[PDB]
Structure formats: structure tokens, C-alpha cells
Amino acid sequence: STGSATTTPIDSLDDAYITPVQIGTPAQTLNLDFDTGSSDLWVFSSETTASEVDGQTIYTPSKSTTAKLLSGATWSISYGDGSSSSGDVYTDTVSVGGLTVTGQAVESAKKVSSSFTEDSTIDGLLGLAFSTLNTVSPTQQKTFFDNAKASLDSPVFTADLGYHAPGTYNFGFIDTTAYTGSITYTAVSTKQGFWEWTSTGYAVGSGTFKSTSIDGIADTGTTLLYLPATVVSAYWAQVSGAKSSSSVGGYVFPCSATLPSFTFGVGSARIVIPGDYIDFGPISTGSSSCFGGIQSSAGIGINIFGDVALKAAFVVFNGATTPTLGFASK
């Protein structure tokens, strides 16, 4: 089998991407944030504290003839950005772009933190990291990809995120028309439960390539590119007036600037992030200080190849017996 679904930016800055997901019988369609940095499929629901729902579409398990309470199971998760959610668990039928899994764990939120409530466009998350990170207790549950894998034509999914435009998540096949040149594959460590790999270096604009190993995660659920402070300083030094602001929480730059590109290495291959991808707009409405899309990972404890990086590439998440990652230009 295969599946194919369009993923759409939630706003004009590409702050995140939503993909429609069918849950239950009859189908209840929710728009979920596909997150290769976590491993829980959770949704706003009929059980969510009423004051914590503000415009989201909810899953109502009592209206699904295929929903079954997973007795005794609870979940609770906290994300790198400080947000969190928790609740109980059902199993139900879940389909993405024509690909169907029966008996998928659907984690129903009883509580969500403020940033989720405040974002009316995201109805929940669909985790695509390794199932070892799944938070369900006392019986850990599998991700949608893990449940689907054996049935897929090839044990892979691909992320093709757009810049200020829709893109595609495919399951079970590689669309050879969606990229240019060849796909360069690189090793993955699953020891922390992430799609963790090592970039071979970087360049700033038309500058010379610096060969250096940068360990990090391919994370569709993180907006920006978080890299070591040395790398980030070298980038922003090429933008007149750019500076790190403690009060804002990162590098800012004059909105009047033209940003240079940023290149990252994948083996001997190179992915170029155009400068415009690195502009995240005014820090507050009407400001002429703009927020940068490349930020320091210092104090996160890990480098993160988030959407800013991933959207410049066609990315293969290869779930073969030994997982690997593939990157192509597009």
C-alpha cells in the first residue's frame, strides 16, 4: 500500500504545517501537525477541558463505531518549546492520504497547555519519530508509521515541505518526479528515539564550504534551524545590523536586509537554503526588527534541522531494518 497527503502552512510565515487525517467511523477529519520529532498521535477531543478549546476541530469517540477505550491507559507529553498535553487513549481507524491503519492508538486530550489552545489551526499532532518515545502508560503504543510499515510497498515516508506553499507527505514510495539530481543517503542513530544524523558542514552565502561534523535531528515539528553558536554567529555576521537579543529570545535583523543563503552538507552533497527562507518577519506587529530563522541550539542540548532546513529539500525517512535519511535538492 501507499498514501499521499498534502501538507499546508498554518500561516504566512510557515510556522508549522497541517495535514488532514481521517479518524474513526464515520470519518472525523482533523488537521494534524506531522512531527518527526515526537511519537504520540494526540487530538483535541470531546474530553478536552472546555475552557482549553478555542476553535479547534475535536474528535468525539462516542460517535465512532470503531472506537474502543484502551482501558487504564494514560499519556502525558512535554515539548521542547515548553508546551504540553495529557489525557486518555482510544484505539480507532486512522487514514492518511488513502493509507489506513486499524487499531491505531489515538490519544485523547483531557488537558492542553495555553499555546495549543491559542492556535486554532492545529487539532493535534501525529508523531513520526521512533515508537520508543511514545508516552502511553502502562503499555507503550506504536506510531502510525510503525503500524503501517509492514503493509507499505517500501518501508519509507517522505517529507516535501513547501516554502510559503503547500507540499506533500508520501508513505510507502519515493516520487522520482519530486526532486532534482540524486538522493544522498546518510546514517541515522536511533539511540535517542529521533531521526538523528550528522551533517558534513556548512557554507554562508557564496562563501567557502567549512567541513565539520554537525550532529542533529530531522524534525518536521520544529519551525526553525537550530545549530551551534559558532555556526549561527558566522551566518548572522554577514547581515548588517543583525544581533542576538536576550529580550526577544534570539537573533534579530533589520527587516530591510537581503539575507544570504545557508548551505548544509549531506555526505558529499549540498542543500542550499535560500536567504528568503530565513526571514520570519517582524518581532511584533509593525516592528522593523525581524526574527531570524537560524538560531543557536546552545542550551537545547541538541541541534535541530527543522522546517527551515527541511523545506529546502526532498527528505526520505527510510524505516528499513537499519534506518537511514535521504536528502535531494528540488
Side-chain angles (χ1 to χ4, degrees), residues 127-141 143-148 150-190 192-221:
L128 292 170
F130 295 88
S131 292
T132 51
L133 299 183
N134 177 266
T135 78
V136 178
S137 181
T139 307
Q140 185 170 66
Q141 302 291 304
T143 69
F144 175 83
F145 179 55
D146 213 333
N147 281 323
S151 302
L152 300 174
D153 289 359
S154 182
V156 306
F157 70 88
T158 65
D160 178 14
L161 303 180
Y163 166 67
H164 294 353
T168 305
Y169 282 102
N170 292 327
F171 292 83
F173 73 104
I174 288 163
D175 179 0
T176 60
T177 71
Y179 59 88
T180 63
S182 51
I183 303 177
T184 294
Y185 289 86
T186 196
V188 164
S189 170
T190 66
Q192 293 191 88
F194 301 119
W195 293 90
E196 189 168 0
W197 65 290
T198 302
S199 172
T200 49
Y202 71 98
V204 176
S206 62
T208 61
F209 189 83
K210 174 74 168 185
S211 298
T212 185
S213 297
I214 307 169
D215 294 347
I217 66 169
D219 185 2
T220 58

Side-chain angles (χ1 to χ4, degrees), residues 23-26 28 30 43-47 57-62 64-65 67 90 92 106 108:
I23 309 175
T25 309
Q28 297 180 40
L30 275 65
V43 299
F44 276 81
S45 75
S46 58
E47 302 179 328
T57 294
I58 63 166
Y59 171 59
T60 303
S62 64
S64 174
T65 58
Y90 293 82
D92 211 339
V106 176
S108 168

Side-chain angles (χ1 to χ4, degrees), residues 209-242 244-283:
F209 189 83
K210 174 74 168 185
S211 298
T212 185
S213 297
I214 307 169
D215 294 347
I217 66 169
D219 185 2
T220 58
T222 291
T223 315
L224 306 184
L225 174 51
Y226 294 88
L227 291 170
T230 50
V231 181
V232 177
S233 183
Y235 178 80
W236 289 109
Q238 294 306 308
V239 182
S240 300
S244 182
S245 169
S246 61
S247 59
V248 176
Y251 279 89
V252 297
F253 69 92
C255 291
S256 61
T258 304
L259 298 178
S261 62
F262 185 89
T263 302
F264 66 93
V266 183
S268 55
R270 307 287 182 255
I271 301 298
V272 181
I273 305 170
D276 290 348
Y277 290 27
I278 297 160
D279 181 3
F280 281 73
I283 62 171

